[PDB]
């Protein structure tokens, strides 16, 4: 076969299930694609440059995870699709010798949902894409962080932005911080209890975190990041396939292997 290389840039990255599910698709769809893709995790030093590394490795495409999604948006040659409004890129493809950035987190999150308003905790690339998608669907969106980081982005979307937890009921409480990665809660336990009591769904992007365990304890409906991982990956695979394998087909393979 002709070979094409792919990977996922993150720091940390060893916990990522992206290689498992992407390689399963590359194997399954090799006849249709007429190439064999192979996908590897790439622990990127914080000081490195996504574009330079993508070119250096000779990748045909890649995903980008924490803490690099906003940087990836900055260093792409071209941004396409909903990524234009996300200020973050999680999917890279070499198209006509240009590094092109997409964002599949926004739609992957949407598709993962079985709500009138939402509280998003966090200010990184995942939070930005989720806020963009939820504002687009007509929910009221509040965002809660510890500093004024990312504030301009969310305010331009029309989000209500907070550093002190708002005394308001939210249908969706979404943990898009890095707290779960580190085995800690993203907020004071009693504050979260307040939200969970009045919430319809506690959603954590990690794929049992302290956030989800607390929701469980309180009998609040909860959802981890598994379905989102599969949909965003499937949507990325569509892009890696030059839009020849539809995300629905990739989803099936990925969900089963995961």
Curated annotation (Swiss-Prot):
Protein name (record): Shikimate dehydrogenase (NADP(+))
SUPFAM superfamilies: Aminoacid dehydrogenase-like, N-terminal domain, NAD(P)-binding Rossmann-fold domains
Binding, shikimate: 16-18, 65, 90, 105, 207, 232
Keywords noted in UniProt: Amino-acid biosynthesis, Aromatic amino acid biosynthesis, NADP, Oxidoreductase
Similarity annotation: Belongs to the shikimate dehydrogenase family.
Active-site residue list: 69 (proton acceptor)
Highest rank taxon of the organism: Bacteria
């Amino acid at each position: 076969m002709k070979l094409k290389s792919f990977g996922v840039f993150g720091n940390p990255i060893k916990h990522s299930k992206s290689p498992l599910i992407h390689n399963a698709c590359f194997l399954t769809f090799q006849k249709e694609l007429r190439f064999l893709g192979h996908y590897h995790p790439i622990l990127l030093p914080l000081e490195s440059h996504i574009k330079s590394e993508f070119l250096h490795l000779g990748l045909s495409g890649a995903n980008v995870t924490l803490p690099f999604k906003e940087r990836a948006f900055q260093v792409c040659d071209k941004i396409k699709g909903i990524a234009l409004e996300c200020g973050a890129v999680n999917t890279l493809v070499l198209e006509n010798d240009e590094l092109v950035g997409y964002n599949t987190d926004a739609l992957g999150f949407y598709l993962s949902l079985k709500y009138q308003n939402a509280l998003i905790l966090g200010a990184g690339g995942s939070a930005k894409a989720l806020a963009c998608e939820l504002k687009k669907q007509g929910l009221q969106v509040s965002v809660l962080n510890r500093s004024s980081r990312g504030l301009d982005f969310f305010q331009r979307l029309g989000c209500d932005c907070f550093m002190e937890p708002p005394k308001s009921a939210f249908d969706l409480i979404i943990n898009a911080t890095s707290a779960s990665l580190h085995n800690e809660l993203p907020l004071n336990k009693e504050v979260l209890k307040g939200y969970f009591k009045e919430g319809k769904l506690a959603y954590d992007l990690a794929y049992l975190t302290p956030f989800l365990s607390l929701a469980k304890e309180l009998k609040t409906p909860f959802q981890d990041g598994k379905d989102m991982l599969i949909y965003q990956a499937a949507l990325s695979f569509e892009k890696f396939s030059a839009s020849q394998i539809p995300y629905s087909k990739a989803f099936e393979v990925m969900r089963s292997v995961f």
